[PDB]
Design a protein around this ligand. Structure first.
Ligand SMILES: *CCC(=O)N[C@H]1Cc2c(N)cccc2N(c2ccc(C(F)(F)F)cc2)C1
Ligand SMILES: *CCC(=O)N[C@H]1Cc2c(N)cccc2N(c2ccc(C(F)(F)F)cc2)C1
Lengths: 212, 215
């Protein structure tokens, strides 16, 4: 069953994350819609054996990554996406911010999966910047992959939330941040999705990934 | 008369600047309005003697800074601000500034913004930033620096004016001196003497950069 406890200490902390659509009305006016967001503790656990088939397995996959550890850097992130927006013609992007006490060069790998099979992998490397006593790794306007744009358009062409949930059930993202110089895994977020029913918009719940 | 030519080599390059107001409609919906922007050549010149009275003078002032040089890092920036936006009061609004500078050197950079009313400093904002190595050069980015309270109330007062010619008249006595310095050496990397009017263009905010020269 669930095991609820603190993370402890990780070398890298995710502080902010957002996936958005920004549409220009005129050169001085921009409307932004957030699909999901984090950052705008005791954590429960999810057994990794409950999610193996939803993520790429075999060479370089989730079970192999988890076996190499450190296991306290592995999490399952549930998202409740906000698809309530009007798509017209626009920048689909992602923001993120990580922090660490160590100056590192980090590589972020985002793998988009369909039925547990990798369809896209985006790879971005970022050097550290010292700010207010720590090292910060911030990406301001990282473009979404083409697959995501078409997937969002597909979701919005469905009349009801239960239909969007059925499409989202087999869509996952595996986000892995690695120290480029040593190849150590700094953070791994296994992301699952559903549509948000809340009037407060997008929601999320983070769990620790455990094997027992 | 104007002297029109290239800037030459500088240790720091301005790549982007904007002043904005961002308003939350709900936790997932935001609108952003740009008052001014840059980065979204042969430059003409302005006699620095024509602006001495509009900026801070004496110790640390424009004349002293220009004298110390490098003179090719000093510019007059004329802005035509876009004030066509709702004023958001008590509703989750952020009045801010973004900027991005780039260099081949790894430096610690300090940005000093002095707001002047009738040639006299009403606010000085000082912010220090470290470099990030990106795409083969050093990048100095500020994405969400808060505007000073003076600016927020001043923007609110301008917007209430019935005609653009009245906003231009108030703006004749408002200037901003932006000085970017290498924190460790005190060398002036960039100095922008900013003057303002309100835009009449259907394309929104506009700007023109001039090199400051002596004679
Ligand atoms: C190839 C780039 C890409 O797929 N970007 C996505 C990355 C991402 C991450 N890392 C975590 C959570 C969400 C997202 N993104 C995303 C997922 C789902 C939606 C949707 F529910 F609205 F469809 C939008 C965006 C972007
Ligand atoms: C104290 C902080 C502050 O005043 N921020 C301003 C900085 C700035 C700079 N450095 C250059 C150009 C414009 C601005 N800012 C600004 C000036 C004028 C307007 C207005 F015309 F709309 F009134 C808005 C913002 C912000």
């Amino acid at each position: 069953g669930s095991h609820m406890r603190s993370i402890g200490t990780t070398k890298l902390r995710l502080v902010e994350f957002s996936a958005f659509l920004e549409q220009q009305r005129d050169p001085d006016s921009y409307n932004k819609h957030l699909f999901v967001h984090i950052g705008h503790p005791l954590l429960e656990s999810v057994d990794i054996r409950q999610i193996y088939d939803k993520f790429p397995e075999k060479k370089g996959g989730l079970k192999e990554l988890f076996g190499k550890g450190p296991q306290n850097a592995f999490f399952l992130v549930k998202f409740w996406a906000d698809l309530n927006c009007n798509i017209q013609d626009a920048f689909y992007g992602v923001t993120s911010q990580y922090e660490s006490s160590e100056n590192m060069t980090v590589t972020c790998s985002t793998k988009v999966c369909s039925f547990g099979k990798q369809v896209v992998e985006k790879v971005e490397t970022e050097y550290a910047r010292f700010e207010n006593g720590r090292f910060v790794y911030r990406i301001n306007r990282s473009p979404m992959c083409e697959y995501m744009i078409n997937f969002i358009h597909k979701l919005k062409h469905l009349p009801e939330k239960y239909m969007m949930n059925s499409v989202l059930e087999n869509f996952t993202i595996l986000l892995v941040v690695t120290n480029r110089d040593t190849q150590e895994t700094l953070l791994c977020m296994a992301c699952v999705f559903e549509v948000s029913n809340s009037e407060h918009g997008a929601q999320h719940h983070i769990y620790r990934l455990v094997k027992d």
